């Protein structure tokens, strides 16, 4: 969830 | 587990010139290196990013350049206002770490320092532990040596050096070297020598008093 | 844009739990990373955390993750730093910080945090020490120095002039070093005239404002 939270934050 | 030197710990330099500061890495970074100013009582500023990009609102006298583990900062004609400590920090990898600093100061003629020894007071006395204070005053660069002398014998311990920053008229440094004695060990001797050593002194200064 | 800025106290003792606070403005606090980073009193910058603004979710420094917790809060766009067991290792400006990171292509990946906004920081002693005033003690021998000698005090920091002020030219205080004792101590030391010695004046005041006491104290031949 955390790599999901980063990836969702730059989009 | 990323290790950062950054170098020199400190460097003197003179409004106008080109300054370089070198970062490396105990291991391949590629490019993500970034560069922060820290100004006394100021809040950090990001100067550079990805090793070479200029962060916004920083004036491109700053640039930075390098890869994997050789990195450097370079400030073409150095401003006054550039006098300050700068952070190289890494973060390729979790967790991100910093250098330990360099510290750019204002380049100066040599200074030889002004020596003075200062005798313990009669209240002091009185406290049960006195202190000896060693003062060297207004001199450049700041690598000095003070060593305390008690009865002709060498005085090592129980001393705590103290230095201020680069003064703002005449840009030089002083520093107060503190011998703190318990009462019956300072009664128990009698001569009390402060030797001062400095390039800008021909020889070792040496100030004392017999109690 | 954005604009940051810390609270917390300026005391903590051994073994309990230090926290500070950081309000972020001028953009979404949902949006972004926010973190901690500090600087020891003579000891390099150290990163602590970084944290989602929306999720919570983050990473810490694994020296200090087993101390650590950092909370937000969306209402007052703010984050907090938990730090139990402190002791004076602890002791250090805290600074508040957004975390950017990026794509560290052309994999999937990304890098760590870099920092592009700081607070101005708030500093935080973690010591057992109570509070006590300095004791003031004269330090006396064509130019002639004197000075006194502020020592014995708790906690940081102390004021030193001469003559209320009226003098300052070729005046220096020191920095202060703290002793084994857990005081605080420091000289101030001014260069005069040796002519104007025996009739001159000078009066070093000190002020330690966290424990009221006021002295002047005047330095004789």
């Known amino acids: 969830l955390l790599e999901l939270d980063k990836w969702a934050s730059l989009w | 587990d990323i290790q950062v030197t950054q170098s020199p710990s400190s460097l003197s330099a003179s409004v106008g010139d080109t300054v370089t500061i070198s970062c490396r890495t105990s291991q391949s970074i590629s490019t993500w290196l970034a560069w922060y100013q820290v100004k006394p009582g100021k809040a950090p500023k990001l100067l550079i990013y990805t090793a070479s990009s200029l962060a916004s609102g920083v004036p491109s006298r700053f640039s930075g350049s390098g890869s994997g583990t050789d990195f450097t900062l370079t400030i073409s004609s150095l401003q006054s206002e550039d006098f300050a400590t700068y952070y190289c920090q890494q973060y390729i990898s979790l967790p991100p770490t910093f250098g330990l600093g360099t510290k750019v100061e204002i380049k100066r003629a040599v200074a030889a320092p002004s020596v003075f020894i200062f005798p313990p007071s009669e209240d002091q006395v009185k406290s049960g532990t006195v202190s000896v204070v060693c003062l060297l005053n207004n001199f450049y660069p700041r690598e000095a040596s003070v060593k305390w002398k008690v009865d002709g014998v060498l005085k090592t311990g129980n001393s705590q050096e103290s230095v201020t920053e680069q003064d703002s008229k005449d840009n030089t440094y002083s520093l107060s070297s503190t011998l703190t004695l318990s009462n019956t060990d300072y009664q128990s001797h009698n001569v009390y020598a402060c030797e001062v050593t400095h390039q800008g002194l021909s020889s070792p200064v040496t100030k004392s008093f017999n109690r | 844009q954005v604009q940051l800025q810390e609270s917390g106290p300026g005391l903590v003792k051994p073994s309990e739990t230090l926290s500070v606070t950081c309000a972020v403005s001028?953009?979404?606090?949902?949006?972004?990373?926010w973190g901690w980073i500090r600087q020891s009193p003579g000891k390099g910058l150290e990163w602590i955390g970084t944290?989602?603004?929306?999720?919570?979710?983050?990473e810490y420094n694994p020296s200090l993750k087993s101390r650590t917790t950092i909370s937000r809060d969306t209402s007052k766009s703010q984050i907090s730093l938990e730090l139990t067991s402190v002791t004076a290792a602890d002791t250090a400006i805290y600074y508040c910080?957004?975390?950017?990171?990026?794509?560290?292509?052309?994999?999937?990946?990304?890098?760590?945090?870099?920092?592009?906004?700081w607070g101005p920081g708030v500093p935080v002693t973690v010591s057992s020490a109570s509070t006590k005033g300095p004791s003031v003690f004269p330090l006396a021998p064509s130019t002639a120095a004197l000075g006194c000698l502020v020592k014995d005090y708790f906690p940081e920091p102390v004021t030193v002039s001469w003559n209320s002020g009226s003098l300052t030219s070729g005046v220096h205080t020191f920095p202060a070093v703290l002793q084994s004792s857990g005081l605080y101590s420091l000289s101030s030391v001014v260069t005069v005239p040796s002519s104007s010695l025996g009739t001159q004046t000078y009066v070093c005041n000190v002020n330690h404002k966290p424990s009221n006491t006021k002295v002047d104290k005047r330095v004789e031949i």
């Open positions: 910080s957004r975390g950017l990171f990026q794509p560290n292509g052309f994999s999937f990946t990304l890098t760590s945090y870099w920092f592009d906004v």
């Open positions: 001028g953009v979404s606090f949902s949006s972004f990373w």
């Open positions: 944290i989602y603004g929306s999720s919570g979710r983050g």
